[PDB]
Amino acid sequence: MHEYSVVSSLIALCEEHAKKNQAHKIERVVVGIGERSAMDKSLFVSAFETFREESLVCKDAILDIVDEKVELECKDCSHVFKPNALDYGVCEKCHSKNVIITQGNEMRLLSLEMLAE
Template sequence: MHEFSVVQSLIGLIEKNAKQNNAKSVSKVVVKIGKMSGIEPHLLKIAFDTFKEKTICENAQLEMIIQDVIAKCEDCGKEFTVKDYRFICPECEGFNLRITDGEDMYLMSLEMDV
């Protein structure tokens, strides 16, 4: 379960941001998780709830925004949401695609008590 190591890194990033803003605690953490990021949201929630104890995030709520996979066809320029992992352009039926969103996990925002 690599979500444990992801959460450890996430909490480290949160603590760094909190320190830079002189925060006493963090009340809300918002992350965006791409459907192709390899992160399982329910496992991330379990890991976050486990590792947040005795940290600045102890009372924080985790909000997850699940991001669809967005692709752009390099042949016709059409940008579209990939559905059912069908990596074919709906406009020209080409395969020359570039993924523009949905592969990563991002820390989007923090609500901190200062």
Template sequence: MHELSIVESLIDLCEENALANNAKDIQEIYVNIGRLSGVEVDLFKRCFETFKENSQFCKNAKLLIELAPLEILCLKCSQNSILEQNVFKCPKCESIEYKITQGEDLHLMRLVME
């Protein structure tokens, strides 16, 4: 249940940005969650709804989540690809030798502040 600590860090980061920009309130928080980030999206949303109540700036914020696909660079054929759900091989040459280039992280993408 690491979603709790991730949400706490997200709210802290949002509050730091609000203070740095002399905002009164945060209205929208946009995050990008990678398919292999290990974040359970529904649990993440529930934790956010619970913990935003204790935030000076995030009480009224709407959380908007974009799920990032799993992108790879094949080390055999040099093809950049997006892997489909539960398929972990290059779609071009079917190699399992690849480097993940996107889809393992969670990123704060944008804040809408007042």
């Protein structure tokens, strides 16, 4: 969740995808960060520059961020959905307290531009 820890995880994640795609160099990494996320985009793009130099694979990668809407799950109520109103923070099937954000709380990878080995 903390920005430098997520980016350090991201560079390794970029490398594993490079192994999985049989690619040696990534030119662009695009991510999705939730609109109500527990993350700071300003430090995220600074941390990305700080860690990308550590690896040849990610060194020249262009970083782009897409803002995404949160997704919610209700503690056992079968409900996972994207909220559509100011009713964020509760389920809509019931309006029970104690629902949790499943997506949009932390960063996700959307696409990578890559050069084959």
